[PDB]
């Protein structure tokens, strides 16, 4: 049972505020990505452009499902793992951060040469929002906490989520 699991675009700081929020709290991060990779032996983009989004999403769900199960740290899933159904179904009764980030800082921060299947250029921007557009409404649904990464720092995201995380709400 995770203390928290981290949701969001790529871009959003998933990996950068995983880190930050995991030591923390003083646990392990676990990435849903990583894990993909440690179980199959086989990198990401290989499985789509071999075997399809659509086989991806289906090692994806069993991943996430795995590490609910067995993480006690905290776990950040890959970005498009809300649109499986049985991965928005799974979250149900965790401690679900979104990480909400906007399309032009989530293009400027996902600007470098990392592959990525379904963020590629011409038009990668174009994209993104597409991207937004259909899987906002999804985070939303499964979040219990949602923080601005837009302009925080990480350290300021991360010291939100700490406090937001021991008060009710
Ligand atoms: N709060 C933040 N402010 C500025 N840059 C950030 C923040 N969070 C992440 N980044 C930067 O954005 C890029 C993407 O980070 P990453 O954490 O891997 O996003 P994700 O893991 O969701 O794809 C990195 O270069 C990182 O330094
Ligand atoms: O947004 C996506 O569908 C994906 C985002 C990633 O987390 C990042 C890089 C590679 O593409 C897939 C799928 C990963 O799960």
Redesign the pocket.
């Known amino acids: 049972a995770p203390k928290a699991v ?1 949701v ?11 880190r930050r929020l995991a030591k923390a709290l003083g646990v392990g991060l676990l ?1 849903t990505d990583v894990a993909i990779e440690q179980r199959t032996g086989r990198s990401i983009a290989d499985i789509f452009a071999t075997d399809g989004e659509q086989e991806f999403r289906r090692i994806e769900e069993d991943v996430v499902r795995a590490a609910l199960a067995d993480h006690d740290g905290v776990l ?1 899933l890959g ?1 498009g793992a809300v649109t499986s159904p049985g991965v928005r179904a799974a979250l149900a009764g965790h401690t679900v951060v979104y ?1 909400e ?1 906007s399309a032009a800082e989530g293009v400027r ?2 600007g ?1 040469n990392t592959v990525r299947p379904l963020l590629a250029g011409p038009d990668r921007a174009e994209k993104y929002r597409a991207l937004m557009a259909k899987r906002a409404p999804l985070y939303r649904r499964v979040a219990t906490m949602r923080v601005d ?6 350290g ?2 991360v010291r939100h989520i700490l406090s937001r995380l021991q008060v009710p709400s």
Do not use: F
């Open positions: 981290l969001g675009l790529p871009g959003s700081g998933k990996s950068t505020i995983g990435d950040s970005g990480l980030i921060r996902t470098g990464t837009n302009r925080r720092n990480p300021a995201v």
